[PDB]
Amino acid sequence: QFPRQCATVEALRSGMCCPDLSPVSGPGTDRCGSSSGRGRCEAVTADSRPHSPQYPHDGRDDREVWPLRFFNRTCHCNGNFSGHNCGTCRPGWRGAACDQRVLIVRRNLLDLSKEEKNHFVRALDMAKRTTHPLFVIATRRSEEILGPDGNTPQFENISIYNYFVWTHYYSVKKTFLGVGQESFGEVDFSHEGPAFLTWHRYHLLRLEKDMQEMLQEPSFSLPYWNFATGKNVCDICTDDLMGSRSNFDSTLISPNSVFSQWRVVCDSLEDYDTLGTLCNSTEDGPIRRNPAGNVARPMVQRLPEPQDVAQCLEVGLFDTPPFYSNSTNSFRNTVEGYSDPTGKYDPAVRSLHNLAHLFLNGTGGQTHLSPNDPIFVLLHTFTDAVFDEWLRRYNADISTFPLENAPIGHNRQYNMVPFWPPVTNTEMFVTAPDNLGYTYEIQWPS
Numbered sequence: 001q002f003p004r005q006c007a008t009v010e011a012l013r014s015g016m017c018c019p020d021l022s023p024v025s026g027p028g029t030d031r032c033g034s035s036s037g038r039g040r041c042e043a044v045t046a047d048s049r050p051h052s053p054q055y056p057h058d059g060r061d062d063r064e065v066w067p068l069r070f071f072n073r074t075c076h077c078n079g080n081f082s083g084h085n086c087g088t089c090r091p092g093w094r095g096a097a098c099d100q101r102v103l104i105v106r107r108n109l110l111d112l113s114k115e116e117k118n119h120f121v122r123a124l125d126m127a128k129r130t131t132h133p134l135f136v137i138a139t140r141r142s143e144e145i146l147g148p149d150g151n152t153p154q155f156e157n158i159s160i161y162n163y164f165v166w167t168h169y170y171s172v173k174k175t176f177l178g179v180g181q182e183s184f185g186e187v188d189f190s191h192e193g194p195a196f197l198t199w200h201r202y203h204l205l206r207l208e209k210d211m212q213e214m215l216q217e218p219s220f221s222l223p224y225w226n227f228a229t230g231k232n233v234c235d236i237c238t239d240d241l242m243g244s245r246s247n248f249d250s251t252l253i254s255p256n257s258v259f260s261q262w263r264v265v266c267d268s269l270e271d272y273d274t275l276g277t278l279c280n281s282t283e284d285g286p287i288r289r290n291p292a293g294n295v296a297r298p299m300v301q302r303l304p305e306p307q308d309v310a311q312c313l314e315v316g317l318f319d320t321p322p323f324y325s326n327s328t329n330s331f332r333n334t335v336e337g338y339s340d341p342t343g344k345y346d347p348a349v350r351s352l353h354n355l356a357h358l359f360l361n362g363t364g365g366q367t368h369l370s371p372n373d374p375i376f377v378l379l380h381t382f383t384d385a386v387f388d389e390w391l392r393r394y395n396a397d398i399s400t401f402p403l404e405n406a407p408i409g410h411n412r413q414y415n416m417v418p419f420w421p422p423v424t425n426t427e428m429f430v431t432a433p434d435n436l437g438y439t440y441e442i443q444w445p446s
């Protein structure tokens with residue numbers, strides 16, 4: 001979403017989001033850090049190609065051709081510089097000249113020290129309460145973005161971790177069609193399509209970076225939860241990490257965990273889809289969680305089996321046509337969890353990443369809310385580990401990642417919605433140790 005200095009009337013009407021870095025000579029004199037050689041304000045590249053025929057409402061939705069409905073000029077940064085005003089570095093690089101390499105290690109949460117476990121939990125909690133220093137979220141679609149009087153931008157501050165929740169919601173929300181009409185839901189800019197793995201990889205990377213700056217700890221890293229244990233229970237749902245079941249309500253989190261204090265955003269879908277508004281920063285009820293609780297649906301009462309991870313890493317093509325939740329022999333669709341681990345599509349099957357979401361039988365299993373439960377972070381870093389191992393094992397073969405005819409939002413060169421600055425799926429389709437500055441300490445079965 002947008003740098004708080006781009007969420008003004010001036011910026012939105014010019015279509016330019018090219019903020020200053022250190023504007024010595026006055027405003028506008030250091031856009032994109034051009035005085036320092038770090039970047040320059042220039043035209044946005046956005047994907048032109050056709051998408052699948054499943055979305056019929058070209059022209060109606062602000063997530064189309066992202067971000068051209070809001071800005072047509074951004075900062076491009078030179079070299080290994082990066083960020084909304086080119087004032088930081090590309091993933092894997094540090095220093096004022098962005099010329100020092102770093103490599104941080106993402107580890108299994110159960111293998112951390114008592115002190116490292118406590119530091120992680122207290123850091124999530126701080127992110128939940130700490131206002132994001134750069135990004136503000138929009139509460140109205142673009143037509144009403146400047147407010148009733150036309151001069152009041154409809155943006156709100158939000159916490160670091162609620163930003164993480166918001167962007168996932170924005171990429172899954174329905175297309176508003178107008179009051180009186182049913183909003184359109186056959187669209188998902190981050191699920192059911194080739195962009196699944198790369199969307200969520202940038203999602204994690206932006207959170208890791210935000211927390212590093214919040215803690216001032218360059219080497220802070222996000223752990224993972226190995227959920228492919230076949231267990232009846234959530235082995236990380238304990239009060240020293242992530243929270244156990246409350247004894248007073250079997251669908252709430254233990255009061256001995258900070259996460260029982262969290263309150264969720266984006267849970268008023270009735271309003272958003274009828275009034276045409278967006279999720280805002282006001283929090284509501286608590287997290288609901290009930291591991292193995294879905295008696296009505298016995299298939300989602302046990303976690304994926306260790307063999308399932310072995311099997312899906314044998315699927316060799318990243319994706320297959322029609323590039324959707326009914327793709328067969330698609331590694332994206334297998335690890336996302338709409339195929340079985342072998343790649344066999346069946347409308348009833350729920351494996352791997354999907355299964356892990358449904359196992360929680362609660363807030364974590366509802367697509368518009370699931371990042372509110374912080375197990376989301378650990379569930380997706382493990383999914384990203386599987387992604388990374390595939391990228392290594394098949395030499396990052398991006399050839400099956402379609403350039404066109406994918407569901408809207410999922411073409412290879414689509415800017416992932418709504419990340420800022422614009423970033424394409426191609427930019428995340430690399431092995432993480434050599435290119436993004438992080439690696440997984442992990443061993444795979446066979």
Ligand SMILES: *[C@@H]1O[C@H](CO[C@@H]2O[C@@H](C)[C@@H](O)[C@@H](O)[C@@H]2O)[C@@H](O[C@@H]2O[C@H](CO)[C@@H](O)[C@H](O)[C@H]2NC(C)=O)[C@H](O)[C@H]1NC(C)=O
Pocket residue numbers: 012013014015016068069070071072
């Ligand atoms: C680049 O953008 C400018 C600014 O227009 C805004 O850009 C988008 C956010 C979109 O939502 C527009 O509605 C915004 O107005 C464009 O300049 C304006 O273009 C509109 C046409 O939509 C025109 O009616 C206005 O009079 C123009 N105003 C100014 C100050 O230029 C410009 O055309 C865009 N260039 C492109 C897309 O190549």
Ligand SMILES: *[C@@H]1O[C@H](CO)[C@@H](O[C@@H]2O[C@H](CO)[C@@H](O)[C@H](O)[C@H]2NC(C)=O)[C@H](O)[C@H]1NC(C)=O
Pocket residue numbers: 053054322324326
């Ligand atoms: C996967 O699902 C899609 C969407 O349901 C199927 O594609 C076509 O979907 C259109 C609407 O976009 C329907 O009108 C058609 O009935 C579908 N095409 C047919 C039946 O040829 C697609 O067929 C599915 N792929 C499978 C099942 O392999």
Ligand SMILES: *[C@@H]1O[C@H](CO)[C@@H](O[C@@H]2O[C@H](CO)[C@@H](O)[C@H](O)[C@H]2NC(C)=O)[C@H](O)[C@H]1NC(C)=O
Pocket residue numbers: 139268271272275277279280281282284
């Ligand atoms: C932020 O979102 C909340 C939740 O949707 C909004 O509160 C709702 O406001 C509408 C007014 O149209 C009421 O009908 C709902 O009953 C309210 N919901 C709750 C849970 O109180 C809130 O108004 C939004 N903020 C802004 C500035 O739009």
Ligand SMILES: *[C@@H]1O[C@H](CO)[C@@H](O[C@@H]2O[C@H](CO)[C@@H](O)[C@H](O)[C@H]2NC(C)=O)[C@H](O)[C@H]1NC(C)=O
Pocket residue numbers: 293294295296297360361362363365366
């Ligand atoms: C969690 O699982 C329970 C089942 O254990 C779900 O509750 C059932 O929901 C279905 C369909 O919504 C109903 O037909 C059943 O009658 C419900 N059973 C009970 C005992 O409530 C619940 O919806 C699930 N919630 C989430 C978020 O996954």
Ligand SMILES: *[C@@H]1O[C@H](CO[C@@H]2O[C@@H](C)[C@@H](O)[C@@H](O)[C@@H]2O)[C@@H](O)[C@H](O)[C@H]1NC(C)=O
Pocket residue numbers: 004131132133136155156157
């Ligand atoms: C959003 O909040 C603004 C405050 O901005 C700054 O945000 C963080 C870094 C905190 O350290 C805070 O103390 C800072 O002042 C306010 O000016 C205002 O309420 C909000 N502005 C908009 C445009 O929503």
Ligand SMILES: O=c1cc(CO)occ1O
Pocket residue numbers: 191353354355357358364365366367368370
């Ligand atoms: O991605 C998700 C998948 C499921 C189950 O399919 O629930 C929530 C999600 O965010």
Ligand SMILES: [Zn+2]
Pocket residue numbers: 168190191
């Ligand atoms: Zn998701």
Ligand SMILES: [Zn+2]
Pocket residue numbers: 353357380
């Ligand atoms: Zn997910």
